[PDB]
Amino acid sequence: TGEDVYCICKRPDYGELMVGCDGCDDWFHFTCLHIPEQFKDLVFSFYCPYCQAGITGKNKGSLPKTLWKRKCRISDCYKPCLQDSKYCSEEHGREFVN
């Protein structure tokens, strides 16, 4: 009598890409948040719009904000950087042509 729903759209999980919020334990579609799919692994911690507004998170004092990782400086790559290193791996660690 009604499958489980998620996100601000309150539609079911039909297989598309989603993030889990860290304030509440809900899940949100990338397309509903207007976040490009290629930024799939560039999110460190996500907080839905209703948790950043203090409506459904867990604080009470400050409000949680979505933190983004540092993307590999190769314009093609959309993988997160390593520690200190400005590249996602050694296979991309070349800064200059010579």
Binding site: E16, M18, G20, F46
Partner: peptide
């Protein structure tokens, strides 16, 4: 973060 794609 925590992501999920069943496809």
């Amino acid at each position: 973060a925590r992501t999920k794609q069943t496809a």
